[PDB]
Structure 1
Amino acid sequence: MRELARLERPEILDQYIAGQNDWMEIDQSAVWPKLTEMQGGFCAYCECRLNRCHIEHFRPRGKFPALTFIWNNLFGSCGDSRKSGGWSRCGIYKDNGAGAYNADDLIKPDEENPDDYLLFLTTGEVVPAIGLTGRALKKAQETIRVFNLNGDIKLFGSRRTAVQAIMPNVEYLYTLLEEFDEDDWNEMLRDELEKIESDEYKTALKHAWT
């Protein structure tokens, strides 16, 4: 997952108030363009390309009705219940598939940097980062469990495939460290990391390159 830069609150959230109003009332096409600015047409939790998608409350509307029209709590997740049932990661799984969970011990990607907690092995698994103990380990282990970041075969398979496709280019660049001088080589690595902003599963591709 990426560290996300939340910026400005959209105007429509000013009007609607918790208790009286419901999420069925509010227009969703008003909210999207700021999330699409924030995230870049990519999922908040898994970093797939968004096509079937929904506005996700990080703390859910049932348990936390206070945080219903609050800009910090909203995220663009993959999957859409309205179109087609049986989606098994991220927003939909957090509710249905993952059982009990404590909401406090999860990586909220606007607040926290994921990179400290999560590591992306080139064999395709996401794991806790090297040397976590106690509470930070519990957050890493539960973010992985509750968003189903390994247990979905579609996601795991797609992520492995992508990283394995670039691993020729990774090995070939690091050989040419020796022959090239530093300014040439550091320009090349900048240029490859420039590409992967526009790519799916960017954090996994980042860990392969750096």
Structure 2
Amino acid sequence: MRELARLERPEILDQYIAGQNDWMEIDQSAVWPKLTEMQGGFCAYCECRLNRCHIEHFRPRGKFPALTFIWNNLFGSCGDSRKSGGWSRCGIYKDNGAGAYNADDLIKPDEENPDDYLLFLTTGEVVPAIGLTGRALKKAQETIRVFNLNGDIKLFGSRRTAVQAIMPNVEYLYTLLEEFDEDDWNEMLRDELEKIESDEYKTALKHAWT
């Protein structure tokens, strides 16, 4: 997961008020293009390419009905309740499959940098970052557990495979550091790091390259 930059707030959230209005009422096609600007057409938590996608309340509408029509609270997550059943990570699992959790002990990707908490191994596990204790460890652990970032075999598989595809190219660049002057080699690495913004699982590919 990525550090997201939440920039501008859409007009429609002003109109609807919590208590009176329900989430079934609000029009969703107004909300999406601002999220798609933020998130780049990728999921908030896992970084798949969004195709079946829903608006997710980071703090849910049951436990926090005050935090409902709040631009901070909304994120575009992979999965859909409507089109098919039994989705097993991210938004849908946080509610259904991840049972009890304190929402305070989760990484919120708009507020925080995830990179200090999470580490992506090239073998395709996501793990807590090197040298965390107490609360910083507990956030890393619970984020991994609640969004099901290792436990979804479909996701674990896809990420592992995506990284293992590029590991010849990583290996090969860091041989050529010997031969070239700095500014050409630094341009080469800048380029590869430019491409992976178009790619799925961009954080995991970054950790492989950098």
Percentage identity across aligned positions?
100
State the 1:16 CA deviation: 0.2
Inter-partner Cα distance in structure 2 for 1:67 and 1:29: 20
Q: State the superposition RMSD in angstroms.
A: 0.2
Cα deviations by residue, 1:158-210 (Å, 9 ceiling, x for unpaired): 00000000000000000000100000000000000000000000000000000
1:101 aligns with 2:101: yes
- Counterpart secondary structure, 1:47: coil
Inter-partner Cα distance in structure 1 for 2:188 and 2:31: 38
- Counterpart secondary structure, 1:71: coil
Inter-partner Cα distance in structure 2 for 1:40 and 1:174: 29
State the 1:141 CA deviation: 0.1
Inter-partner Cα distance in structure 2 for 1:35 and 1:155: 22
Cα deviations by residue, 1:129-153 (Å, 9 ceiling, x for unpaired): 0000010000000000000000000
Inter-partner Cα distance in structure 2 for 1:99 and 1:62: 14
State the 1:13 CA deviation: 0.2
Inter-partner Cα distance in structure 1 for 2:19 and 2:5: 29
Which aligned runs of 4 or more in structure 1 are off by greater than 2 angstroms?
Answer: none
- The two structures have a TM-score, normalised by structure 1, of 1.00
State the 1:44 CA deviation: 0.1
Inter-partner Cα distance in structure 1 for 2:63 and 2:15: 22
Inter-partner Cα distance in structure 2 for 1:13 and 1:38: 17
State the 1:6 CA deviation: 0.2
Inter-partner Cα distance in structure 2 for 1:66 and 1:34: 22
State the 1:18 CA deviation: 0.3
State the 1:73 CA deviation: 0.1
State the 1:110 CA deviation: 0.2
State the 1:91 CA deviation: 0.1
Inter-partner Cα distance in structure 1 for 2:82 and 2:62: 18
Structure 1: gaps (5+ residues): none
Inter-partner Cα distance in structure 2 for 1:78 and 1:182: 40
Structure 2: gaps (5+ residues): none
- Partner in structure 1 of residue 113 of structure 2: 113
* Number of corresponding residues: 210
State the 1:37 CA deviation: 0.1
- Counterpart secondary structure, 1:140: helix
State the 1:120 CA deviation: 0.1
Inter-partner Cα distance in structure 2 for 1:75 and 1:179: 45
- Counterpart secondary structure, 2:144: helix
State the 1:50 CA deviation: 0.0
- Partner in structure 2 of residue 138 of structure 1: 138
1:78 aligns with 2:78: yes
Cα deviations by residue, 1:83-134 (Å, 9 ceiling, x for unpaired): 0001000000000000100000100000000000000000000000000001
Cα deviations by residue, 1:15-57 (Å, 9 ceiling, x for unpaired): 0000000000000000000000000000000000000000000
